Amino acid sequence: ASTDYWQNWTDGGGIVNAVNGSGGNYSVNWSNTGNFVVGKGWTTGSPFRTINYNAGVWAPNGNGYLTLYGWTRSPLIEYYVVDSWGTYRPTGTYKGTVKSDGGTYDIYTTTRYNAPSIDGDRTTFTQYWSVRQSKRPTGSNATITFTNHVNAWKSHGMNLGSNWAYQVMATEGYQSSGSSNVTVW
Numbered sequence: 001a002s003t004d005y006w007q008n009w010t011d012g013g014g015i016v017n018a019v020n021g022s023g024g025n026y027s028v029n030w031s032n033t034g035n036f037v038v039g040k041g042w043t044t045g046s047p048f049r050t051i052n053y054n055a056g057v058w059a060p061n062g063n064g065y066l067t068l069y070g071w072t073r074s075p076l077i078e079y080y081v082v083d084s085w086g087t088y089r090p091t092g093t094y095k096g097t098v099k100s101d102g103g104t105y106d107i108y109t110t111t112r113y114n115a116p117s118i119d120g121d122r123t124t125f126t127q128y129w130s131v132r133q134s135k136r137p138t139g140s141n142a143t144i145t146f147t148n149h150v151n152a153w154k155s156h157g158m159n160l161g162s163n164w165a166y167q168v169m170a171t172e173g174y175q176s177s178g179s180s181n182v183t184v185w
Contacts, residue, residue, distance in 0.1 A: 003040040003184050007069075007168045010036035011116070013175075024184040027057070030064075031177040037069060040184045041168030045070045047150040047160065050143060053169045055182045058138040060086030062176025066136075068144050069170040071118045072161030078112070079128040079160070081105070081144050083136040086176065090131055098130060098152035101143050105130040107156060118165055128158050144169075 003024040010016045013034025019027045020040075028038045042049070051068055058066050068081035082090060083103075092108035099105075108129040114122045130149045136142060150160065171180040 001185055003042060005041050005043045005166050005168060007037060007039045007041070007166060007170060009038070010034070025182070027179070027181040028171050029179050030173050033173050033175060033177070035172075035174050037170050037172045039069060039168035039170030039182075041070075041166060043166055045072070045164040045167030046146075048147055049167065050145050050147075051169055051184065052141065052143050053182055053184045054141050055084075055138040055180060057179055057181035058084055059180065060173065060176060060178035062086050062173070062178065063088045064171065064173040064176055064178050064180075065090065066138070066180065066182070067170055067172060068146065068167070069172065070167035071165040073118075073163040073165060074161045076117060076119075076123070076125040077128060077161050078117070078125060080130070081146065081149050082129065082131040083142065083144070084132070084138060085135065086178065090129060092127070092129060095156040095158065096152070098148060100130075100145055100148035103132045103134075103136060105132050105149070107152060107158070109158060128153055128160070
């Protein structure tokens with residue numbers, strides 16, 4: 001599918017050279033950053049979407065995530081399906097596991113306090129996570145069947161909001177450096 005949304009947010013720290021390439025391709029070179037999120041996807045997320053991607057380059061030199069990323073409003077929730085990471089594997093309050101697309105993912109919840117949200121400014125909100133137990137190899141055509149995650153989350157009382165915001169396959173970094181090149185469809 002054609003992506004219709006380009007996500008390029010940075011808190012302003014360090015260097016984030018994000019390139020909006022042809023079709024669903026994008027690349028990022030980052031150095032000594034604060035927090036940033038770059039990716040391509042869709043303006044309106046869907047719990048039924050099957051996301052395809054191929055990360056031709058996944059080279060974080062520190063804390064960085066290769067992850068499906070999105071938000072819902074009512075309530076405000078930032079969600080993640082993490083396929084790979086750098087030096088730090090994100091974890092939180094353990095809820096259970098879900099097997100999807102050839103991998104096993106741990107399910108976690110965390111809460112952010114007085115942090116920037118999709119609406120700008122700062123607030124407190126919950127984050128839902130599916131984090132692969134081992135890093136998914138990159139360079140291949142990968143699939144994330146999002147419905148499997150939504151359903152597993154629902155079974156543990158993790159319900160998404162009713163107003164869907166963007167949904168992208170992203171590169172997120174925190175006080176690190178690295179490079180990524182990803183194609184989404």
